[PDB]
Amino acid sequence: PKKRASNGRNKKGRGHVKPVRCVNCSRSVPKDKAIKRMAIRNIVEAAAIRDLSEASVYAEYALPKTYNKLHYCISCAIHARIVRVRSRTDRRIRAPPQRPRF
Amino acid sequence: AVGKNKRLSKGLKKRVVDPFTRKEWYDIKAPSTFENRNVGKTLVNKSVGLKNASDSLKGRVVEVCLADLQGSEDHSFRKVKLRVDEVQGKNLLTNFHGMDFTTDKLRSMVRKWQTLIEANVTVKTSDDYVLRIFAIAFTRKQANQVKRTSYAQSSHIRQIRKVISEILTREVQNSTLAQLTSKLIPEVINKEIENATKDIFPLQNVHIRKVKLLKQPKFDLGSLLSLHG
Amino acid sequence: TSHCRFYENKYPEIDDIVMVNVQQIAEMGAYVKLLEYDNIEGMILLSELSRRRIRSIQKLIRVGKNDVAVVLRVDKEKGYIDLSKRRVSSEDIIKCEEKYQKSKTVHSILRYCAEKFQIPLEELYKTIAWPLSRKFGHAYEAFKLSIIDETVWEGIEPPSKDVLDELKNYISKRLTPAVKIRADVEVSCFSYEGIDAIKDALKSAEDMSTEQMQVKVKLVAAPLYVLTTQALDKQKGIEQLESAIEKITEVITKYGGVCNITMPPKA
Amino acid sequence: SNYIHIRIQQRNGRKTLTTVQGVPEEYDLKRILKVLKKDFACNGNIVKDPEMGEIIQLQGDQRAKVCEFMISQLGLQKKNIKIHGF
Amino acid sequence: DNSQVFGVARIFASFNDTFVHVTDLSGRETIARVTGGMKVKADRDESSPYAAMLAAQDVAAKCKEVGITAVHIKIRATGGTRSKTPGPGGQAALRALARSGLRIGRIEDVTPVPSDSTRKKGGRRGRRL
RNA sequence: AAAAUC
RNA sequence: AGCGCCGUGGCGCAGUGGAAGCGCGCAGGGCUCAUAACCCUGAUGUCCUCGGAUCGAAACCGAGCGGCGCUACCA
Ligand SMILES: [Mg+2]
Ligand SMILES: [Mg+2]
Ligand SMILES: [Mg+2]
Ligand SMILES: [Mg+2]
Ligand SMILES: [Zn+2]
């Protein structure tokens, strides 16, 4: 039975797509069906900014952020809670989960 | 700790003694085109007859933040690599080697729903410095757009990059190292690129990255002293 | 009395590894006495107690037995020592038990001295043990070098000379290590006269025997002649046996036969 | 000398393991494990046991069958090999 | 400027190891090379934040005895193909550099990132834990 | 994680 | 016949110099519905016999015993 209309892959008109490797289990998966997450974080946590700020020669220096895109395999992500099973009627809600920070 | 087999391919006692007492410091000075000319202080093993300390010194590379040599914080993202070539004794003098962005600004400028433009050029300077210069641009959302994306057609990219090539070649082939750096520090090349490319496509975050040196001619001491003090 | 420690200081230094006798565990861990530093109670809590989770809280820790522990913190103010059992390497435990038995041996010797002389062990360690552990780094190595060189006792004032005599007697009785060096040689004779050759070769071999180094070349079979020697220094026996090899080969080059070696001088 | 005998070790759920102790070195062991595996459809191990010797552990509970292989491969005696009931 | 002696921290943190290693502005010669895994014995906690913190304290003491006063931060991951994320311990190493007297400036990340350049360990189907 | 029987 | 190794509490290793060790077993218990796995609890010794320095020895030695290993059947 057709689980999804878009086949849960999102190509529809390219025949084939270059595959990219998972960051957790190193699985090769097509880039479209690769459930990607941009992890923008600081080099230090919120519990360390104080010590670095008081141990800094520059008074107004703002610590820079680390950027990287994460390409998961699907199984690791279902395991690592970043992607969640849904009820059948709620599968089709394409919009990203509504921001809790309202 | 000590998760070791000690399979060494043997003396009863090894005299590590003091490694730092046989070491001396040396102050680094930047080319005059940078404002805060004093750089820092590097350590090195003391002189011996067979091997000159200055020999080991000439050839060193030092990374500095441009804001440290400017004083302003409008240049915290840039990264200047200088080259140790001549030493005056307890003080060493350096020549320009290269430029870069800290990775943070680089990944910051690369956002989604906008196509970046990467251009490269290889070019000889006025005197002999064979350089390679990169150029990054980002297509800008108009101040009126409802179009979520701001993608540019490949023809626009190609004309833009041809213009970039012309501008960079014109700027480099004319001027020397000192003039080139004095141009880069206010990044007026950025303004010139923006002005030229405003006719073809609206452009944003244009910068000049990774000023990479390929070849340098035979060293001239008088020129180095000219760049200093 | 038997109270003084083996080492120099009273309270432990940081990140040092010793071996502890377990006495009791209540709820936070085992606060047990030390047997390498000065006698004092240190705490080994549960998450610092077993490399394995905590499934057998009775097996790996034994009330009344000694196991290796490591110093994590030392509060050199009132009374407190922090110790851990997990933070000891698999190879390190061997050196820890080596040092513990070292300490126990020296402690037992000095305890015999104190029990026979009724002097508190603190004075025995102060007047003797710590100067030797300063000059050589250890008191056991110092006893070993006293066996071969009396000069280790120079520069230190004993509590009494009779104590020195009794302790030197005890270390000679206990810490004495005459290395048995055996070689074996094969007479492969085919010639006319070989028995008188063996007789006079072994007579010469026994002639070079010294009052301190005695050699008796024994027989276990016709070809296999065994040379057994005692070497008070391990270097004289090999020379004795090489000289013997020279003697037998010289004797056999003239009578006509041949003598071959299987095992040259080895301790 | 060099007596040969087979033992049975039971397990949970009636499953069983068979061990022949002592094997002549005239024929090598891997070449014999190969044909043990097919004719028996059971997993096998050339395990090392100190002071005991190399042992070809096999699955199942079979004694006349390992014996029937023995009669043909190298064994020509059928007198030294002993079968244990257990 | 009160003549701070500047260096770089060059913190390299894998998931199995943490490297706190200060060197001079040039970076050619190396002041301190004490490793995070050195400070622990279990060999499973080589990258544990405590090990990095303790190695970092060792580095700070070595710097203050050498004469180093200020340090630039060079956080690094394994890079290449293995991973792109900082090691779990390097963060505590940076914290320990922070709260240890030494002055800090110019924190940045220097993770070597490839342009999708080579095959990655694991095969097609990858790790199957 | 290793999970066995039924 | 000669020189090397060993001497359990059922079995092995460990300490050999404060005086009875651990695991393996065995027995029982607990975990459980229930078997393994796992977690607790024990009861067994002139650690082969006889002498000796030693406050002290099962431990250090030796004066003999039993069983193994090599030389090799030693007219
Ligand atoms: Mg289905
Ligand atoms: Mg089409
Ligand atoms: Mg899975
Ligand atoms: Mg493989
Ligand atoms: Zn994965």
Strand G closer than 7 A to residue C11 Cβ:
no
Beta partners for residue D54, in sequence order: D48
Q: How far is the CA of D12 from the C1' of G35 (A)?
A: 7
Q: Does some domain include residue B14?
A: no
Q: Show which subunits contact C, needing at least 3 CB pairs below 8 angstroms.
A: B, E
Separation of A77 CA from ligand 5 center, angstroms? 7
Give the domains, in start order, of chain E with CATH numbers: 3-129 (3.30.420.80)
SS (H, E, C) A45-59: CCCCHHHHHHCECCC
> Does the distance separating the beta carbons of B42 and E26 come in below 8 Å?
yes
Q: How far is the CA of D47 from the C1' of G24 (A)?
A: 21
Domain that holds residue C42: 16-91
Q: Is the CB of A65 inside 8 Å of chain B's CB atoms?
A: yes
Q: Enumerate the known binding-site residues of A for Zn(2+).
A: 22, 25, 73, 76
> Does the distance separating the beta carbons of E111 and B103 come in below 8 Å?
yes
Q: How far is the CA of C179 from the C1' of G51 (A)?
A: 27
Strand G closer than 7 A to residue C223 Cβ:
yes
| Neighbour-count burial for C50-82, b at 16+ CB within 10 Å, e otherwise | beeeeeeeeeebeeeebbbbbbbebeeeeeebb
Domain that holds residue D84: 1-86
> Does the distance separating the beta carbons of A64 and B104 come in below 8 Å?
yes
C135 with C72, same domain: the answer is no
C185 with C136, same domain: the answer is no
**CATH, residue C243:** 3.30.70.1130
**CATH, residue C72:** 2.40.50.140
C48 with C109, same domain: the answer is no
CA distance B80 to chain E (A): 12
C256 with C183, same domain: the answer is yes
Chain C: which residues have CB within 8 Å of chain E?
A: 51, 86-89, 92
Domain count, chain B: 1
Long-range contacts of C91-96 (CB under 8 A, 24+ apart): C91/B2, C91/B3, C91/B4, C92/B1, C92/B2, C92/C17, C92/C68, C92/E41, C93/C68, C96/C17, C96/C18, C96/C19, C96/C68
Q: Which DSSP string do the residues of chain C spell out, in sequence order?
A: -----SSS-SS--TT-EEEEE---B-SSEEEEEBSSSSS-EEEEEGGGT-SS-SS-TTTSS-TT-EEEEEEEEE--SSS-EEEESSSS-TTHHHHHHHHHHHHHHHHHHHHHHHHHHT--HHHHIIIIIHHHHHHSS-SHHHHHHHHH-GGGGTT---S-HHHHHHHHHHHHHHS---EEEEEEEEE---SS--HHHHHHHHHHHHHT--SSS-EEEEESSSSEEEEEEEESSSSHHHHHHHHHHHHHHHHHHHHS--EEEEEEEE-
Instruction: Tell me which of C172, C200, C227 is where a domain ends.
Output: C172
Q: Which residues of B touch E110 (CB under 8 A)?
A: 103
CA distance E50 to chain C (A): 13
Closest CA to C62 of C32, C28, C89: C32
Quote the CA–CA distance of B139 and B148 in Å, as a whole number.
12
Contact B71, B83 (CB under 8 A): no
Q: Show which subunits contact B, needing at least 3 CB pairs below 8 angstroms.
A: A, C, E
CA distance B107 to chain A (A): 6
Question: Residue D11: which nucleotide is closest by CA–C1'?
Answer: G36
Q: Which residues of A touch E113 (CB under 8 A)?
A: 68
Q: How far is the CA of D10 from the C1' of G35 (A)?
A: 13
| Neighbour-count burial for B57-89, b at 16+ CB within 10 Å, e otherwise | beebebbbbbbbbbeeeebbbbbbbbbbbbbee
Closest CA to E52 of E8, E90, E109, E22: E90
Contact C139, C125 (CB under 8 A): no
C148 with C164, same domain: the answer is yes
Candidates C17, C72, C87, C91, partner chain B, best to mutate (most B CBs within 10 A): C91
Closest CA to C25 of C94, C83, C93: C83
Q: How far is the CA of C137 from the C1' of G20 (A)?
A: 35
- Close Cβ partners of B62 (under 8 Å, ≥ 6 residues apart): B28, B39, B40, B42, B81, B82, B83, B84, B94, E25, E26
Closest CA to A60 of E101, E1, B71, B102: B71
- Measuring alpha carbon to C1', the residue closest to nucleotide G70 is C220
- Name the pairing type of β-strands E11-13 and E18-19: antiparallel
Of E98, E103, E116, the CB nearest to A57: E103
Domain count, chain D: 1
Do E and A touch (≥3 CB pairs < 8 Å)?
yes
Question: Residue C55: which nucleotide is closest by CA–C1'?
Answer: G39
Separation of A82 CA from ligand 1 center, angstroms? 22
Quote the CA–CA distance of E51 and E6 in Å, as a whole number.
25
Closest CA to C35 of C16, C23, C20: C20
Strand G closer than 7 A to residue C47 Cβ:
no
Quote the CA–CA distance of B186 and B207 in Å, as a whole number.
12
CA distance A90 to chain E (A): 30
C25 with C86, same domain: the answer is yes
- Close Cβ partners of C171 (under 8 Å, ≥ 6 residues apart): C109, C143, C146, C147
Domain count, chain C: 3
**CATH, residue D58:** 3.30.780.10
Strands (DSSP E) contained in B70-115 are 78-87, 91-101
**Rounded to 5, what percent of chain A is helix, strand, coil?**
15, 15, 70
Q: Show which subunits contact E, needing at least 3 CB pairs below 8 angstroms.
A: A, B, C
Separation of E125 CA from ligand 4 center, angstroms? 11
Separation of B112 CA from ligand 2 center, angstroms? 26
Separation of A25 CA from ligand 3 center, angstroms? 9
Domain that holds residue B147: 21-229
Beta partners for residue E70, in sequence order: E6, E103
Q: Does some domain include residue B120?
A: yes
Strand F closer than 7 A to residue D16 Cβ:
no
Strand F closer than 7 A to residue D14 Cβ:
yes
Strand G closer than 7 A to residue C116 Cβ:
yes
- Measuring alpha carbon to C1', the residue closest to nucleotide G40 is C58
Q: Does some domain include residue B13?
A: no
> Does the distance separating the beta carbons of B28 and E25 come in below 8 Å?
yes
Separation of A2 CA from ligand 1 center, angstroms? 8
Candidates E107, E113, E124, partner chain A, best to mutate (most A CBs within 10 A): E107
